[PDB]
Amino acid sequence: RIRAFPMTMDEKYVNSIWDLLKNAIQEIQRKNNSGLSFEELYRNAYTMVLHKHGEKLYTGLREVVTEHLINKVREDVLNSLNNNFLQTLNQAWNDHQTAMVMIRDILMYMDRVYVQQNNVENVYNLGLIIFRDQVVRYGCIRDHLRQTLLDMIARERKGEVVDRGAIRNACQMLMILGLEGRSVYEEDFEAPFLEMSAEFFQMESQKFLAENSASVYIKKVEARINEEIERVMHCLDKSTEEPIVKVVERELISKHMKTIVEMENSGLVHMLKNGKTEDLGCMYKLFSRVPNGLKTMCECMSSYLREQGKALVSEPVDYRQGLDDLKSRFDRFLLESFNNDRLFKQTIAGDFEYFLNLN
Amino acid sequence: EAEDFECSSHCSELSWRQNEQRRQGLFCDITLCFGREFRAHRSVLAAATEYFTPLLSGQFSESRSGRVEMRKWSSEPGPEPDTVEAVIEYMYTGRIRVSTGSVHEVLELADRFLLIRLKEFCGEFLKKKLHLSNCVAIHSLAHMYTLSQLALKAADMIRRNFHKVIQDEEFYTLPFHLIRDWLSDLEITVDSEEVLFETVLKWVQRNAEERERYFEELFKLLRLSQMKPTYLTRHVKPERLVANNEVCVKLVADAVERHALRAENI
Ligand SMILES: [Cl-]
Known part of the structure; x- marks a missing residue:
């Protein structure tokens, strides 16, 4: 028993x-x-x-x-x-x-x-x-690890060569210490990283808007988005890709939306006047990333298209051809640059339905 | 197009064929000592339980030895060789027959070698075989080898038939830590609190030279207030085990004063 x-x-x-x-x-x-x-x-x-x-x-x-x-x-x-x-x-x-x-x-x-x-x-x-x-979050070590990692990323952006592997090992360590979580990595590294990055991108936008055209600026934002993604893949944790891209988008696009589109002799209206199809497509693609991005482009285009249409309906067969040439031009822009977007199509139609009803 | 194949017998064939290799001592790379030695395969043992992974890793002495010495069992010359063979065959085949007489060693081998499913079966086997005749023995195994569900069921049975459990010799075999826990338990059903004192004296008397040191802590667990003042002066106080300890003398002295103060309060 x-x-x-x-x-x-x-x-x-x-x-x-x-x-x-x-x-x-x-x-x-x-x-x-x-x-x-x-x-x-x-x-x-x-x-x-x-x-x-x-x-x-x-x-x-x-x-x-x-x-x-x-x-x-x-x-x-x-x-x-x-x-x-x-x-x-x-x-x-x-x-x-x-x-x-x-x-x-x-x-x-x-x-x-x-x-x-x-x-x-x-x-x-x-x-x-x-x-x-x-050890890692003691105090003197915590502050120095934060100072070291951020100084390396700040140096790399300025052109210096840094040990990317040393950053990857430190970030992997901070992630594991989160105990199947990102609490340690977020508090110790990500939060001050996004802070110092936002300050860097704000000053980056200020320099680029002061000397480059709207087309060159848009290309430089795409280049910065790619540089920051490549940095996340080789130095930081994969979960930092969305927060860093959002900060790049906030500081380089969101905060300068009306400035980029209304840029004197290089903006949306300039591109519309000289038929710069590729540049408008690049503007559409970049501004579609942020909220109110395409709306800003539409508002800028609407103001110009209405002004052109009002001038066309004011100034026999040549008058009818003028409205058709304006329609054909913006129908090309809608397909070739604005990817036949519903918002842009509604704006082009809405503007045409305004000035054609005026006279 | 591509097709997926699944060999129906491959799972059962691999296990039985490796077990037949072991019984013939073919391709064996490890020796298990419990004495009788058991030749086995490192790959099978490491697959059966997480225990063999660091043992045969290489970071410890045993990997360079080729033989592992399993010591300090419940019995002096280790567990029954047939039981050890059944547990080793289980690690290969996954099939085992457990009896009422071998369950204690199968559970000891399963718990120690972290064989979770085999430990669960032993717990389920003892749950179906739980009765008032083996409740004290089953509780000891469940408390020892952490079978929380079985320990609750076995304890809830002892709490109800404590008057019958304290009558049998099986309860007086229990070590001090279990005796101390049962006296501390408030849900236990006893005809009188005076019976609890009579069982403590019977437990200490079973092994006088080895259980006299525990009487002081066990007396402090007793509810002296629930006992009658006549029994506390004529049977509790004149005892040899209570007269030796000075704190046990003051305990029955404060109890007699507590009964007098409560009677005048009415
Ligand atoms: Cl135009």
């Missing part, structure tokens, strides 16, 4: 088991994992959890990891602030990940029995929280 042999574990025996595991964890942190028997270390951690001493093992594990990352790892990163900071931080990050894998393996029974039962973070996630809080 069904048998059971539960035994009481002596307090002095629990301490000797923990002392053996504490030493093993410390030896793994020192990268001296060779010569350690997995089965005997697993069994010791198993015996502790099995005899309901999982809390002592969990509290102890949290203590040993914290002691190591504050007294050894934090100091190594703090001593490297002005001498290979990213190289030392990533080395500390790779050393932590390697150590935590072996530590979670030895305490595997605790990870499947104790952490599940007592609604606490698993060995690997606890290790990430301790690394995140005591």
Whole structure:
């Protein structure tokens, strides 16, 4: 029949088991994992959890990891602030990940029995929280990592050559420390990155509008969108593509919509007058990215087309041909440049229905 | 056009053929010591449970040894060789026969080697076989090997027949931590709170030299207020185990004063 042999574990025996595991964890942190028997270390951690001493093992594990990352790892990163900071931080990050894998393996029974039962973070996630809080988001390190990464992106945009791999490793690290989330990456990197980028693009638009034509400006916005996407694919996290493109669109297009379209001797009306089909198509494609973009183009076109139409209905067969030549011209613009857009077609029709009813 | 093929027997064939290789010791690369040694395949064991992955990884001593020594079991010369063979064959075939006499070792081997589905079956096997005759033994296994659903069902059965459980010798086999938990439990059904004190004295007397140190903590768990003042002076106070501990003397002294103060309050 069904048998059971539960035994009481002596307090002095629990301490000797923990002392053996504490030493093993410390030896793994020192990268001296060779010569350690997995089965005997697993069994010791198993015996502790099995005899309901999982809390002592969990509290102890949290203590040993914290002691190591504050007294050894934090100091190594703090001593490297002005001498290979990213190289030392990533080395500390790779050393932590390697150590935590072996530590979670030895305490595997605790990870499947104790952490599940007592609604606490698993060995690997606890290790990430301790690394995140005591190293990456400590203060001097957090501010310097933010200063380093942003200074590199600011330098790269100015023409300097930077280690893109070092940025990718730092961003990958900030993402993982988010614990299957982007909270750490968003707060520490993305938020100040979008702030300093918006300031850069605002000043970029100011220079380009002051010396380049509307056509050249539109080409330079497309070039900046592509440069910022290529930067996300090689340095940052894939989830930063939409927020950075939106900032490029806000600072280079949205905030200068009426300025670009009404640019004296280069804008929409100038393109309409000289029949610059390709340039209008490029304007349509760029302004269709932002809200009220095509509306601004339509309002600018409507004002001019109505002014031309009112001048045509005021000034026998030549008068009828004038309205037909104006219709054929804008029908070409609608198909060849405005991709036969419903809004542009309604505007062209609406303007024609206004001045043809006037006279 | 392209077509997809699925071999109907391939799943069952691969498992049985690798198990026949193991029984013949063919292509085996690992030795499992429990004594009798069990030759097996690293690829199959690492596929059966997450436990063998770091053991045979290369970062630890065992990968360079080729033999793994499984020690510190419930029994001195390890679990039953036929039971170990059944658990190793399970890691290959996925099929196992569990009996009422082998369930405790199958559960010990499944829990230790993180065989979740086999641990679940053992829990479901003990759930269907749960009765007042084996409730104390099943609770001990469920509490030991974390079978929360089974532990609740077995505990809810003991809480109802505690008067019958404390009558049988099976309850006095239980270790201190379980005895302390049952005394701390408030939903347990007992005819009198005086019976609870009589069971503590019977438990300590079973192994006098090994359970005399636990009497002080167990006496503090007893509800002295619910017991009659006549029993507290004539049977509780003259006991040898209570007279030795000074804090246990003050506990029954404060209890007698509590009964006198409550009687005058009416
Ligand atoms: Cl025109």
